[PDB]
Amino acid sequence: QIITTDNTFVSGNCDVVIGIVNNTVYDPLQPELD
Amino acid sequence: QKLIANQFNSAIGKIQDSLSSALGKLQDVVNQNAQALNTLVKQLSSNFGAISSVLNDILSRLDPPEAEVQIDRLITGRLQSLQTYVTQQLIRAAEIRASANLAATKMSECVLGQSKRVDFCGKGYHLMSFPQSAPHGVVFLHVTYVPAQEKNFTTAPAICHDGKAHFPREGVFVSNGTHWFVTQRNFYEPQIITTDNTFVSGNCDVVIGIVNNTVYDPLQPELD
Amino acid sequence: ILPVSMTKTSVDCTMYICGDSTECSNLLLQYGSFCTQLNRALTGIAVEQDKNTQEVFAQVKQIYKTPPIKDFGGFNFSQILPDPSKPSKRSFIEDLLFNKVTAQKFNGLTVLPPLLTDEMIAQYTSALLAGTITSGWTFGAGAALQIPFAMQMAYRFNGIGVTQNVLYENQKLIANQFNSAIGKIQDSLSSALGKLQDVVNQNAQALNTLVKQLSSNFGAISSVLNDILSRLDPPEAEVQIDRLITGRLQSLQTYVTQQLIRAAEIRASANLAATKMSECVLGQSKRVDFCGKGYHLMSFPQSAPHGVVFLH
Amino acid sequence: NVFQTRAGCLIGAEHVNNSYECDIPIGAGICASYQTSQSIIAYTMSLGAENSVAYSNNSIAIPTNFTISVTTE
Predict the structure, then answer these.
(1) Which of residues 31-60 of D touch B (CB under 8 A)?
(2) Is residue D32 helix, strand or coil?
(3) Which of C55, C78, C246, C262 would disulfide-bridge C274, Cβ 3.0–4.6 Å?
(4) Cross-chain CB nearest to B208 (options C146, C168, C285)
């Protein structure tokens, strides 16, 4: 499934993690509010 | 909370009445060990084919070369009796050892912690436990939740809405006969079907039993 | 496969050591308590066999029964449910087990019947089955609560961390894999039960050894004490009989000591079976490899002579 | 009274067609108990009350209330 703000949760800036990849998170509830 | 506290306080009172009205598992260990000892003492007065069961008496009535072949029989018979007692005590110690290893496991998993292991910490779903000491043993008071009064309902695997199939996140779909609700599956507490209560997967064709209904979508009025 | 019990055996210590001989009987009294100790040990082993069997099978209060309509969402249990078509109301797999596993009331040896008959034990395995397939785990924790079988299966899937839509989207496939897998058990068994069979072999070997020890002389002039009494006068007959008493005592002591050690093995196996019944038949276990290999979904009990079979 | 069983021949107990929980075990499925005048009776034990569960392809039972129980081991 696509990466979304309800598939995921945040914690801190990206560099705190030893291994991380850049990608987009779609944020679907924003389109639903729109 | 007040109901649950009253049920708990009431349940402890029943334990006290039951014990003041049994401990057979402990008592019969004490009885078995007394029987073995009294049997050891009784074996002393047996003759084993000797002229008397008393060594001083044999020595009073026989000279040494005749006395010794009588005394060798009492030694043989008493050794045989002790070999029997020590063997049976070793076998009993293995049972008590297995029971103590079980009790140390219940202390670890029922008194510390909470256990998912069905019927390990008493019948029903385990809440917690308390130890109490007993002579040569231990008593666990196991506190358990038991689901009580219950109602029949109609139910469906999934809900079909905009051609999407919806499944409950954390509950089960139920109907009072006219309306559909989602509820937690150990305690009846109904709620309307929502996108916060559900997740979609695929279209309505594949699910064997599936019922048409509305999913609420809670931000839709808030567009106003 | 687990052993649960062994044949309740009792031996009259006097009847084994002595025939009709009052002479032998009167000499045996000089050894005091040994025959009382040997009877207490063997009756202790005997009552434990019924307790082992109760603790495995008597988990349930109600005798649950399946509906007339076997509509379990495509899953088929006919191999494992009872046959009403026959006097012995075992399931097809239970008959197949009972036929596969393959009287000596002589020198004071006796065999006591078990408390629950084989038909009552098969009625408990049927109760455990019917409650499991119509209510999932709930009949262990309290009342049986009905639920449709495809939903009880959706919860077993969540219990192993797979989302429930994976079941409903694949229900026919999963039912076919299940129905197919049950068939292979029937082939595997009809085509072994060594765990149960060797408990039977071990007890028969021990009893035949007790009977063979009767014909040994133990250094006496004969192994028949009527022959001794016929050919000798009392002061010589008694020491020859005292040899036979000594050898026959050592023979029972050996047999009972070995039987106590074997009883402790079967007791450990029965407590394991009662735990597997509790955690694998009722409930669903997180304990890796406890309820068979892979992730546990559910299990079914089947009765067997002196044992239990779990289909995990 | 005289009665004959897989467990042996039993004397001084009355055999009945009823079934109850096992009070004193005799063997091979038979139990004995003191019952009504008051007498020793011998009988085939019952394993429990039957319950045909109300199964259907769309029916479920939900608990509406709970009990807390304390139990002794």
Answers:
(1) 54, 57-60
(2) strand
(3) C55
(4) C168
- Residue C179, Cβ density class (10 Å: 0-12 exposed, 13-18 middle, ≥19 buried): middle
Interface probe for D, chosen from B155, B159, B182, B207 (most Cβ of D below 10 Å), is B155
Q: How far apart are CA B64 and CA B73, in angstroms?
A: 14
* Contact yes or no for C160/C294 (Cβ under 8 A): no
Name the token pair of C20: 């009709």
Residue type, B214: T
The residue in chain B having the minimum alpha-carbon distance to the alpha carbon of residue C242 is B49
Residues of B in contact with A33 (CB under 8 A): 219, 223
Tell me whether B90 touches chain A (CB under 8 Å).
no
Structure tokens at C127: 């109760």
- Tell me how far apart the alpha carbons of residues C157 and C165 are, in angstroms, rounded to a whole number: 10
| End-to-end CA gap in chain C | 11
How many Cβ atoms are within 10 Å of C31's Cβ, its own excluded?
21
CB contacts of A32 in chain B (<8 Å) are 217, 219
Alpha helices in chain B (DSSP H): 2-19, 24-42, 55-61, 64-106
The packing angle between helices C118-135 and C92-100, to 10°, is 140
How many other CB atoms sit within 10 Å of the CB of residue D3? 15
Asked whether the beta carbons of residue C140 and residue B48 sit closer than 8 angstroms, the reply is: no
List the single residue in C65, C73, C115 with the smallest CB-CB distance to D25. Answer: C115
Name the burial class of residue D13, with classes exposed (0-12), middle (13-18) and buried (19+) by CB atoms within 10 angstroms of its CB: buried
Chain D residues whose CB is inside 8 A of the B149 CB are 63-65
Torsion of CA B188, B193, B197, B202, to 10 degrees: 130
Shortest Cα distance from D37 to chain C (angstroms)?
Answer: 28
C64 closest CB neighbour out of D25, D28, D53: D53
D57/C72 Cα distance (integer angstroms):
7
Q: Residues D66, D69, D70, CA angle at the centre, nearest 5°?
A: 160
Positive or negative, the CA dihedral B87, B93, B99, B104 is negative
Q: Please name the amino acid found at residue B17.
A: D
Question: Which residue reads 């735990």 in tokens?
Answer: C275
Q: Three-class SS of residue A33? A: helix
Nearest-by-Cβ selection for C117 from D22, D29, D48: D29
Return d(Cα B125, Cα B115) in angstroms, integer: 9
CA distances from C301 to C129, C280, C281 (A): 7, 9, 7
Q: How far is C151 from chain B (nearest CA, A)?
A: 7
Rounded CA separation A12/B98 (Å)? 52
Structure method:
cryo-EM
> What 3-state class would DSSP assign to B185?
coil
